């Protein structure tokens, strides 16, 4: 009957490291191994109430009384030095093999059928499109996020590390490569071939990704913010806390992974957003809305179940979406 597995899990393929942030001057990007790190500092901010009022605080006397109480906060801030205009973001990326193999799965017939489905996908077209989109997300500085917004020029340098040295080196102009269009380029095709060979291999392929963004002299950079629950403590806390590994501002690994996963342009809604991160039930945290709802037949679980159990193979784009979810991983399976 080929019942679906009660416990299903997939290992996270294509896992990056923390994006270390460092600062320097442009046209010295080559000798950037000794660039000083960007440090997270402390500063005091005094604001004023600017949020919406609930029709009972709109009395002028209460508003003036609440303004007369100073609103003080302590925030973590990260800045470029007052003589450095370039932010260097460096992280390491492992492209693991055994991409379609589940990490944990109950039913052995479901094992054979799922591995047969992945084998059909890989010998039909393989990871050609998926690794193309991942290499595009590497080539443009999507992992900088807000650091990519107002940069004069962004250059991404990607090096293949085989044993301890650069086997093959890439250099891209991130602002020329779009954040929503996946064209074809020769160096991009070479990077896609390397990533696809890593996904189809039995070991791993190591890449280091170094992006230089010309933010501005002494401007304010944006490391990943840390999620800390207040938990109803009586003392006032610092409102903003930035992430750092060793006295050096950094971006979270899952933030970089979410940036790399932004390849899904096949969701049923219109591509006004463009690509979105590959997730089950197509959730977008910034938009607060989950595309690929299960009421439509385009969510990951129903597509996978139709593909592997009832042999209802979806469209090629939906097959790419399902295999991209397999790259992403996750804990699956009903009770």
């Amino acid at each position: 009957i080929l019942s679906t597995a009660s416990v299903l899990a997939f290992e996270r393929k294509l896992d990056p490291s923390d994006a270390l942030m460092s600062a320097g001057a442009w046209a010295q990007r080559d000798a950037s191994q000794e660039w000083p790190a960007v440090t997270v500092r402390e500063k005091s901010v005094r604001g004023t109430i600017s949020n919406r009022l609930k029709t009972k605080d709109r009395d002028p006397a209460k508003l003036d009384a609440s303004i007369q109480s100073p609103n003080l906060q302590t925030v973590d801030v990260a800045n470029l030095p007052s003589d450095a205009d370039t932010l260097k973001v460096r992280f390491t990326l492992r492209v693991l093999g055994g991409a379609g193999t589940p990490s944990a799965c109950n039913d052995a017939a479901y094992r054979d059928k799922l591995l047969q489905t992945v084998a059909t996908y890989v010998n039909d077209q393989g990871f050609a499109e998926l690794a193309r989109r991942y290499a595009h997300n590497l080539a443009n500085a999507r992992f900088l996020w807000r650091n990519r917004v107002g940069a004069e020029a962004v250059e991404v340098r990607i090096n293949h590390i085989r044993q301890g040295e650069v086997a093959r080196a890439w250099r891209f102009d991130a602002l020329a490569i779009g954040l929503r269009d996946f064209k074809a380029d020769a160096e991009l095709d070479a990077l896609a071939e390397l990533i696809a060979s890593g996904l189809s291999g039995s070991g791993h392929v190591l890449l280091e990704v170094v992006a230089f963004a010309r933010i501005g002299d002494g401007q304010e950079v944006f490391p990943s913010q840390e999620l800390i629950l207040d938990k109803g403590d009586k003392k006032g806390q610092k409102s903003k806390t930035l992430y750092s590994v060793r006295d050096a501002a950094a971006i979270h690994s899952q933030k970089i992974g979410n940036a790399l996963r932004t390849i899904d342009t096949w969701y049923p809604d219109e591509d006004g957003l463009g690509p979105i991160a590959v997730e089950p039930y197509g959730s977008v945290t910034s938009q607060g809305k989950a595309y690929r709802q299960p009421k439509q037949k385009l969510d990951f679980y129903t597509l996978l179940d139709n593909w592997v159990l009832r042999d209802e193979a979806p469209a090629v784009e939906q097959q790419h979406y399902v295999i991209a979810n397999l790259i992403r991983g996750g804990v699956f399976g009903e009770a």
Partner: protein
Amino acid sequence: PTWQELRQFIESFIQERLQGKLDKLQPDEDDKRQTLLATHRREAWLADAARRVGQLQLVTHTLKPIHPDARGSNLHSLPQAPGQPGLAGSHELGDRLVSDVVGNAAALDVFKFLSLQYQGKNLLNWLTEDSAEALQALSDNAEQAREWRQAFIGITTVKGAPASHSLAKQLYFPLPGSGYHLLAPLFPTSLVHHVHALLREARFGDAAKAAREARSRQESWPHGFSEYPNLAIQKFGGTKPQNISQLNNERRGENWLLPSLPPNWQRQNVNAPMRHSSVFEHDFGRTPEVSRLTRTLQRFLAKTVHNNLAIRQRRAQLVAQICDEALQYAARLRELEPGWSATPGCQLHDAEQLWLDPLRAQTDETFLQRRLRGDWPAEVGNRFANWLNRAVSSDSQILGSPEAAQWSQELSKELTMFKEILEDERD
């Protein structure tokens, strides 16, 4: 002993429950008070209690702390006490055991009704055995008593087939000969409740805080206290702890984890002793760990010799800890720049700079590599011994007696071990 008095107690308790729900609801209309008094005063309320018991369960190891979307089998089990030594667990929990409740958060009234102590002890053991005092106060008929007894006793048994959800943890353990077992662990809510009670007594108890106030005024007290540093809070329910369990509702999350941390978990920085003349008293001397070690050595230098063998042993591993920390401190200076010792300066500790920076020999093939190879500087041990002599209490009573002789002998042993460590640094 008498079923009449147990009936009196249960009728009394449902009477405070009735008046409490009438006062809290304050029903002035909608005929709520009549329905409350017609359903919570007779054996019909026992029928509702038997209905509500099937949705609840008493457990000692629950699964709901693991991802709350996981639907698995919660267990009420006490593991057997192992013969192997030096390990803790749930098998120490004997009479000091508190039972968790899992299920609906509105049917817990039957739990406090079932955990009553009417004549001296719990109702659970009364309903397990064929007691004449029990099994008749709740039912006039024998069949009703039997069905209510089975209902109220099955609350401690496993309900349904044994199942651990996908979101629950399952960990392979290799058997000694060519095998594995799956080992799905459950969260020991009884253990964390017991440790939570102990830690709450130690950190907020009346005697504990009285001892803290006694220490704050630097006066004597018949007992001391504990501090419990570096505790961590792991909450299970973000806003609804009662959706997990009643014990997790008593302590709203707050796992109160203990700090199993390595000594290098607070690595501050590495600094070069540039313009100073002797690192052991000037830069090595004010790291907090060695400061604590030398203060303990200061306290143990002037001590009684009633337990002199144990005291000398403790001081032996003490000075061993100072020498180990010195070796660690040199090892972490080994990650600095290779040529920091060649910087200009009037006082830079050139005698100890051979040991402080091994890596200078790489850049200086003929300037200092052969000097470090041939000299093999072991006078650094002598300088550190002189620093330790400066760091020991200047007691003439020990110097006159053989206590200084034993201290010098153990110091000589530790320093010759330390010198043998520094001897083969050229390999």
